[PDB]
Amino acid sequence: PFPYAETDVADLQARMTAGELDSTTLTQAYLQRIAALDRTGPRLRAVIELNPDALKEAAERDRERRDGRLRGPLHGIPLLLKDNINAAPMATSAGSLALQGFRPDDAYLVRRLRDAGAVVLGKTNLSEWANFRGNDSISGWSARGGQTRNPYRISHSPCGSSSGSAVAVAANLASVAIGTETDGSIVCPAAINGVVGLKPTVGLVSRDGIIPISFSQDTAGPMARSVADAAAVLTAIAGRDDADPATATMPGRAVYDYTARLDPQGLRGKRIGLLQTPLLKYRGMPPLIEQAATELRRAGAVVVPVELPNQGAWAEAERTLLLYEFKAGLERYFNTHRAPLRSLADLIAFNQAHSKQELGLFGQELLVEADATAGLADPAYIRARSDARRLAGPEGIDAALAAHQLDALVAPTTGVAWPIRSDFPGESYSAAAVAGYPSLTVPMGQIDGLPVGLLFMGTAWSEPKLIEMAYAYEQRTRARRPPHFDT
């Protein structure tokens, strides 16, 4: 039994601080487990590239500790980063063969994690280009990283686009991980793999140094086995960055310790709206969501059934804004970091030239459609961006919260994992993604051995409250169960 399995960040830190564990031991333990479960054995393929300097980093953190120069709660803690996040000296490929030799400098959030003392173990696989490449795509697949597998049943999907990060955390391949979300890419794979996933308000965490899709919806976020671990990571990565204008829009930003919000009485006096959608009747779901509602009520919260105004009405507008922002953002990123590719057209041409390795399972229709967009000055785009944001936020999530004076909206995150070699109606997480509002999924059980999560959504900047509520729910349920491997 892995000696660090299911061990929280605070506990690992306590052990190292007591001199019973050091970063190099913990780091090498994870690396050995990665070799045994990710590269061989069940071949989870959650890790696309190891950091050659992982041991060096861990050893330096230990020397600093012995010298009495601690950096904080994450000192010596090993973590993994989705492969669309820049982090030297590894490549940042977004899973594409086109960027296999592209090794840009650290993204802002990575600089923050390293300054906090975290050890970067490596990069995790993701649906190629964060699943914004083609139609009928396969979640968790990329040309460079292959197919990531769900550890609860390796024949099934890990979902995406933060596939490797969710799987790695669920399989105890690292303490915590960082993923990114445009629309469902953090909370969906987190729920599908039985872990906690938190997508913050757009602007809380800098997007600088991340291969993008949408500046309107994109955001990095923590993935962990517990809410406390996710809160510790958020505390380290949140912050204003001059390179990302969205971070300047945050009201009253301060050096906030989100772990202070880990209140076991966090649901007392709260009001929650249980979203009514067909997902509540998903096979095997009724008992789980009913039990969750009961736990929330017993914890002191009022739970009332509500419908999200404009549910899905933003679909068309969102599709439009993503196409326009993807071309603009990707080309800006290529230029800023001097990538070997200079345009979206170059990428499209590359995949065609390497069709055997890149276009064998599905195409690149989204890249093609995005390349044909006029630009950000197009009236149609401006209208779409405005409509999507309005429908999902002010007239969506906010309208529901105001109608019953609620603190949050909850619902099952999604259905269960499906066979890889083969969209669940009623999902609600798109509202938070499109509104740029915070969402957080917590394990709430399983159906036929496959994890199911409980989703929490709130208005902009409500992370402190969402964490309090999610933690309170988690502490009285402790529903997560680790995956069982054959050998």
Side-chain angles (χ1 to χ4, degrees), residues 1-422 424-487:
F2 193 55
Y4 312 113
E6 308 304 304
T7 307
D8 295 308
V9 172
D11 289 300
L12 291 172
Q13 186 55 244
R15 297 183 186 186
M16 292 189 279
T17 300
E20 295 191 62
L21 175 67
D22 52 39
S23 190
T24 55
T25 298
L26 183 56
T27 295
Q28 300 201 91
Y30 283 128
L31 290 173
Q32 185 172 303
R33 190 169 171 80
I34 288 173
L37 297 174
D38 209 70
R39 185 170 55 183
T40 65
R43 299 179 183 177
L44 301 177
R45 299 208 75 173
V47 180
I48 191 171
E49 190 185 348
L50 293 172
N51 175 12
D53 296 329
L55 182 58
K56 178 178 67 63
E57 284 175 43
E60 193 56 47
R61 303 296 79 100
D62 286 335
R63 278 187 284 280
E64 297 174 336
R65 183 181 294 279
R66 302 203 296 284
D67 191 57
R69 299 181 181 179
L70 295 175
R71 294 160 178 280
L74 300 184
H75 193 106
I77 298 295
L79 57 74
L80 287 160
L81 304 167
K82 183 174 181 178
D83 200 40
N84 57 351
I85 302 171
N86 296 357
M90 304 152 271
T92 296
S93 71
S96 175
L97 291 175
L99 301 176
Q100 59 175 57
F102 173 58
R103 309 181 181 74
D105 303 306
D106 290 0
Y108 186 76
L109 71 83
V110 173
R111 297 203 292 285
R112 290 191 69 74
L113 286 169
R114 280 177 158 148
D115 292 322
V119 172
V120 179
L121 287 172
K123 313 297 292 297
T124 51
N125 193 37
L126 64 160
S127 302
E128 213 185 79
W129 295 106
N131 198 35
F132 204 73
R133 198 195 78 180
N135 302 322
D136 303 319
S137 61
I138 303 173
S139 296
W141 178 87
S142 74
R144 180 166 177 259
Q147 181 67 59
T148 295
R149 298 174 178 286
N150 190 309
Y152 290 82
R153 191 169 259 117
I154 60 78
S155 56
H156 293 221
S157 185
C159 196
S161 60
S162 303
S163 319
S165 285
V167 170
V169 171
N172 287 99
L173 302 186
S175 169
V176 295
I178 306 298
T180 73
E181 176 156 333
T182 296
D183 192 329
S185 284
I186 283 173
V187 298
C188 208
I192 287 287
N193 294 285
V195 298
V196 173
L198 192 167
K199 182 203 77 71
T201 301
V202 171
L204 181 65
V205 181
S206 179
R207 283 82 57 74
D208 202 55
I210 303 178
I211 296 180
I213 290 181
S214 166
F215 53 73
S216 291
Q217 305 180 192
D218 283 12
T219 185
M223 298 180 86
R225 291 173 297 279
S226 70
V227 175
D229 285 5
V233 174
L234 191 66
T235 297
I237 64 177
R240 186 175 184 178
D241 176 13
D242 294 323
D244 182 1
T247 65
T249 70
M250 180 177 190
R253 181 195 294 276
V255 181
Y256 199 80
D257 176 14
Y258 292 98
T259 68
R261 293 281 68 69
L262 300 174
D263 188 345
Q265 295 187 177
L267 283 162
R268 275 292 219 64
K270 296 298 196 305
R271 294 177 57 75
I272 297 174
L274 176 58
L275 297 177
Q276 304 297 294
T277 78
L279 191 55
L280 297 178
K281 306 309 296 180
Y282 179 95
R283 188 184 67 65
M285 195 69 79
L288 295 178
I289 193 63
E290 280 180 303
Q291 185 59 57
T294 295
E295 294 296 331
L296 293 172
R297 290 182 176 116
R298 293 295 179 294
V302 172
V303 179
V304 297
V306 304
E307 294 184 299
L308 183 66
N310 292 305
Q311 165 66 302
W314 57 76
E316 181 170 57
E318 176 184 16
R319 181 178 189 292
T320 297
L321 76 87
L322 294 181
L323 290 168
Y324 280 76
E325 295 186 7
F326 176 67
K327 181 182 183 178
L330 184 65
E331 304 199 321
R332 178 169 68 75
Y333 170 100
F334 285 159
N335 174 281
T336 299
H337 304 287
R338 304 182 64 182
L341 298 173
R342 302 166 61 63
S343 67
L344 180 45
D346 295 327
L347 174 58
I348 292 171
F350 174 97
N351 291 329
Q352 295 181 303
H354 298 72
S355 59
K356 170 57 184 177
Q357 298 69 49
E358 290 287 1
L359 310 175
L361 298 177
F362 56 100
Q364 62 181 337
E365 301 95 334
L366 293 177
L367 301 189
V368 172
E369 177 159 37
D371 194 51
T373 58
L376 304 181
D378 192 317
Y381 159 69
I382 296 180
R383 298 197 297 283
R385 183 178 62 189
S386 179
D387 290 332
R389 186 41 59 80
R390 174 175 58 73
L391 294 171
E395 290 167 31
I397 288 170
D398 295 324
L401 295 172
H404 291 272
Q405 198 176 310
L406 308 171
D407 294 286
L409 303 175
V410 302
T413 306
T414 184
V416 298
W418 55 92
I420 295 173
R421 290 174 178 289
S422 77
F424 299 145
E427 300 176 308
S428 298
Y429 60 72
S430 179
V434 177
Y437 290 1
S439 61
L440 192 174
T441 182
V442 182
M444 76 161 297
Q446 297 179 174
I447 296 177
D448 299 306
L450 300 175
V452 174
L454 179 64
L455 179 75
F456 291 76
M457 294 190 291
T459 192
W461 317 115
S462 65
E463 291 83 6
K465 182 189 297 181
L466 289 185
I467 287 172
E468 303 184 315
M469 295 179 74
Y471 180 74
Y473 166 74
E474 178 200 58
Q475 292 306 110
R476 60 176 295 136
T477 54
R478 303 293 293 289
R480 173 178 157 77
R481 289 293 177 285
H484 182 298
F485 301 98
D486 305 330
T487 310

